[PDB]
Amino acid sequence: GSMPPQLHNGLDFSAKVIQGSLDSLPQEVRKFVEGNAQLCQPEYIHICDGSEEEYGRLLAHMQEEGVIRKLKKYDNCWLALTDPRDVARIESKTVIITQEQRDTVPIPKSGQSQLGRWMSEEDFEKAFNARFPGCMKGRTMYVIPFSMGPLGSPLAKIGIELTDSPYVVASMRIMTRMGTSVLEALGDGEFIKCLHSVGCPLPLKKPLVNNWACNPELTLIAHLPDRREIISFGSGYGGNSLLGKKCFALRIASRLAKEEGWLAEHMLILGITNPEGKKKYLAAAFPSACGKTNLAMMNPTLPGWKVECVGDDIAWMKFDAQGNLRAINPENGFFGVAPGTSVKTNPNAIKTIQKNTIFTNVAETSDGGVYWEGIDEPLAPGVTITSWKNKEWREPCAHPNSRFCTPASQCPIIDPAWESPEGVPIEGIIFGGRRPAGVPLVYEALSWQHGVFVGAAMRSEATAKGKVIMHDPFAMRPFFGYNFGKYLAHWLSMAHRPAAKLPKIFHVNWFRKDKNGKFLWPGFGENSRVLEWMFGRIEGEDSAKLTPIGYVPKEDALNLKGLGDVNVEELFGISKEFWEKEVEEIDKYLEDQVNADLPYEIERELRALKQRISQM
Ligand SMILES: [O]C(=O)C1=N[C]=[C]C2=[C@]13S[C@@]23[S]
Ligand SMILES: O=C(O)c1ncccc1S
Ligand SMILES: [Mn+2]
Ligand SMILES: [Mn+2]
Ligand code: NA
């Protein structure tokens, strides 16, 4: 873009650019970069090109400043350890700004909304002014041009993230498509404006802990959908700082999707091929605490079946002119929870993460390897462990929210269409939650409307003493870009869309325990048997029986060959007393939390379920 006019010498930042050119940027890109540079006062501006050279040098530099360590056991893998105050998304400091609160969250009947956090426009200007002026003093402002989705896909959308964190740059290179080709594709078009800062201008006013710059007290993750802006301050943690992911691809994206006729959801996408050489794509939404990544990369136990991964976290879906629900994975990598990852739980992840992968808050072995709880692999004596707190270890060795951040292209079961610009046709949508009692292994919704209800009704046992069953509709509770009632209405409207081929909707539960606490289902790759049943159902097979909660596998329909005796009686048991309570808790929840914005059809599904249960 062109040089700003000025009476002095404070507005044109061209002389501080150390890679790239303000002149070569599209006009609105320069205005976004230069205006924030005027505000944040970085020492330098680096316009990222996405090259391997850039990446390699940025890593080595972080290595030089003690901010990351090379993991010598592996091929180009790296470890970051954070300030223990900056380890996770902070929901209570995550907000969406709109003129009217009701556009962002429903106004609850009696309680506080659990479905979002609204902040007023005026409150946010004050909060911004108290954080961003001068915040990058002494630092480089990196400019990251990025695409969500395959470059050029009709479903893809472009952002520009400004950040003062090299860690965010490196991770965005993995988790998005980043660099010069994006700028060239963008041209004079529109882009989501993403501004991030760790909130630690130099000279530092407060102690730097573990060489991890952050500002926990002023952490604030804000979304301004009307301005097409995401503005995030004080956290380097991925869900807070990698703005393409939750901020853009769920919060901003879900609101855009509502307005444009598509869906942005917290779903994995997998492709499954059966022994008859037929392949289907499925999407699944489980709470953050559950195992999307494991299901998306499942190694099936059933012979002749194959599972391939399109994505493990976020799906962008649009019914096309032909009525097919086409989906893309808008991301470029996997930002997976490391603990619990083993050759038994996810052998394909184990394979993926030994090259070109950045790990955060895991333990390090003395031979330059990684360790965490649940890795389920012994260490040779001699090999010692440094914890994620940078101390010798024999409390966990890795933070429970520690991560790997790995390229999608490296997954040995990555689907051949995982980057196809047209997306993949979704034929089933799976909801699920961790339920120790009452809820069967699998059931199928009676209708589209019943299925949307099933999404809305999702509950799951929270990670621990005492247990709590929390609501998490569509697995979107932390992620709604707008009023949940209106999101319900948007999903319900798909039934009325000309030509739409509405996928079958299922609900799963791998967690049911019997009368004495015994797991009723062995899980892992045996979950391929559930996927088999769903596959058949989608093909029209007569393999279901009706129950009050929906369809379940009829007698002998579920493939149990090789498993022995399975207590299907208890696993598929439906208790009237459990379901009476369940429907009441769902009622109370929807009435309070959705209130005047609850669609008629969802109230009707509630009444119908109540009625079916009453007739048991
Ligand atoms: O089990 C368990 O855990 C399960 N199932 C189904 C679905 C989902 C889960 S977790 C989540 S989160
Ligand atoms: O909380 C989430 O669902 C999540 N999913 C993937 C990667 C990071 C996060 S913060
Ligand atoms: Mn997620
Ligand atoms: Mn309708
Ligand atoms: Na560190």
Swiss-Prot record:
Phosphothreonine PTM positions: 180
E.C. code: 4.1.1.32, 2.7.11.-
GO molecular function: carboxylic acid binding; GDP binding; GTP binding; magnesium ion binding; manganese ion binding; nucleoside diphosphate kinase activity; phosphoenolpyruvate carboxykinase (GTP) activity; phosphoenolpyruvate carboxykinase activity
Residues with the N6-acetyllysine modification: 72-73, 93, 467, 515, 518, 588
Cofactor note: Binds 1 Mn(2+) ion per subunit.
One GO CC term, this protein: cytoplasm
Post-translational modification: Acetylated. Lysine acetylation by p300/EP300 is increased on high glucose conditions and promotes ubiquitination by UBR5; acetylation is enhanced in the presence of BAG6. Deacetylated by SIRT2. Deacetylation of Lys-93 is carried out by SIRT1 and depends on PCK1 phosphorylation levels.
Entry cofactors: Mn(2+)
Pathway(s) per entry: Carbohydrate biosynthesis; gluconeogenesis
Residues at the active site: 290
Activity regulation statement: Phosphoenolpyruvate carboxykinase activity is regulated by acetylation and glucose levels. The anaplerotic conversion of phosphoenolpyruvate to oxaloacetate is improved by PCK1 acetylation on Lys-93 (K91ac), Lys-467 (K473ac) and Lys-515 (K521ac). High glucose concentrations favor PCK1 anaplerotic activity by triggering acetylation on Lys-93 (K91ac). At low glucose levels, SIRT1-mediated deacetylation of Lys-93 promotes the cataplerotic conversion of oxaloacetate to phosphoenolpyruvate. Phosphoenolpyruvate carboxykinase activity is inhibited by 3-mercaptopicolinate.
Expression triggers: Regulated by cAMP, dexamethasone, glucagon and by insulin. Dexamthasone, glucagon and cAMP increase levels, insulin decreases levels.
Subcellular location(s) per record: Cytoplasm, Cytosol; Endoplasmic reticulum
Keyword annotations from UniProtKB, A to Z: Acetylation, Cytoplasm, Decarboxylase, Endoplasmic reticulum, Gluconeogenesis, GTP-binding, Kinase, Lyase, Manganese, Metal-binding, Nucleotide-binding, Phosphoprotein, Transferase, Ubl conjugation
Renumbered residue ranges of the record's region Omega-loop: 455-481
Annotated binding of substrate, by residue: 89, 237-239, 288, 401-403
GO annotation terms (biological process): cellular hyperosmotic response; cellular hyperosmotic salinity response; cellular hypotonic response; cellular hypotonic salinity response; cellular response to cAMP; cellular response to dexamethasone stimulus; cellular response to fructose stimulus; cellular response to glucagon stimulus
Stored HAMAP family: PEPCK_GTP (MF_00452)
Family label: Belongs to the phosphoenolpyruvate carboxykinase [GTP] family.
Reported function: Cytosolic phosphoenolpyruvate carboxykinase that catalyzes the reversible decarboxylation and phosphorylation of oxaloacetate (OAA) and acts as the rate-limiting enzyme in gluconeogenesis. Regulates cataplerosis and anaplerosis, the processes that control the levels of metabolic intermediates in the citric acid cycle. At low glucose levels, it catalyzes the cataplerotic conversion of oxaloacetate to phosphoenolpyruvate (PEP), the rate-limiting step in the metabolic pathway that produces glucose from lactate and other precursors derived from the citric acid cycle.
Subunit and partners: Monomer.
Protein name per the record: Phosphoenolpyruvate carboxykinase, cytosolic [GTP]
Organism: Rattus norvegicus
Organism lineage string: Eukaryota, Metazoa, Chordata, Craniata, Vertebrata
